[PDB]
Design a binder for this molecule. Structure first.
Ligand SMILES: Nc1ncnc2c1ncn2[C@@H]1O[C@H](COP(=O)(O)OP(=O)(O)O)[C@@H](O)[C@H]1O
Ligand SMILES: [Mg+2]
Length: 214
């Protein structure tokens, strides 16, 4: 029942802060704003902890001017200013059999990822090949958790950019198409094939000057 409360009454337009009722216009406005917020967010230093709180902070920075629920995961009830409450504990990509994390799996998976990152020292001290493989595993874990109602891709990509930066690697998603990212995501989650994601991260990553100069 509560998932309908993400939309205006009898509409396919997500409730938003921009004053927009046209779903196409909302998409374009949001795309432009999240791109700009990403440019500005890149100026912020990477944190010492790459945790679920940080992921929520990224989503909030990218989306708070668009959605009231920016930074809030979809397992959690969210009450809009209009007094209605929304959430969406279960989500499955269209056309596909394998769903994203359901309900409390979202928190459990983000906790497991946090622990893995801590154990691996945020992927510091790796070879280029190792870093790419490990970054791909982190990304597929994020993909499955899919913690937000919308905006997961933009965030996950920002989380990776900052994780990379703190580990001495530049990860540049602009080097590839959306289609390639989608393909790699589908292969990993729908077809249990982790290779395309590994190749993707190899292709868009290089060690930074400092990591070379050291
Ligand atoms: N069928 C799928 N199975 C698993 N992951 C997918 C699938 N399709 C897309 N993805 C990935 O899910 C993530 C979120 O996609 P995105 O386009 O940001 O949607 P949203 O805005 O709904 O969160 C991206 O990393 C994307 O590549
Ligand atoms: Mg997105």
């Amino acid at each position: 029942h509560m998932e309908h409360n993400y939309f205006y009454k009898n509409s396919a337009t997500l409730k938003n802060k921009h004053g927009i009722k046209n779903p196409r216009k909302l998409y374009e406005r949001c795309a432009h704003e999240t791109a700009r917020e990403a440019v500005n967010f890149r100026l912020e230093p990477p944190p010492g902890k790459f945790d679920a709180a940080y992921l929520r902070t990224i989503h909030w920075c990218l989306f708070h001017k668009t959605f009231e629920w920016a930074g809030v995961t979809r397992d959690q009830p969210f009450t809009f200013e209009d007094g209605s409450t929304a959430c969406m504990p279960a989500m499955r990509p269209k056309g596909y059999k394998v769903p994203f994390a359901v309900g409390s799996q979202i928190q459990r998976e983000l906790k497991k990822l946090e622990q893995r990152l801590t154990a691996k020292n945020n992927l510091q001290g790796l070879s280029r090949q190792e870093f790419a493989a490990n970054a791909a595993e982190v990304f597929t874990a994020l993909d499955h958790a899919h913690p937000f109602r919308k905006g997961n891709g933009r965030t996950q990509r920002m989380f990776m950019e900052k994780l990379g930066q703190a580990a001495g690697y530049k990860i540049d998603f602009s080097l590839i198409t959306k289609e390639r990212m989608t393909y790699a995501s589908i292969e990993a989650m729908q077809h249990n094939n982790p290779e395309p994601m590994k190749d993707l991260f190899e292709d868009i990553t290089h060690p930074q000057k400092s990591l070379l100069l050291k």
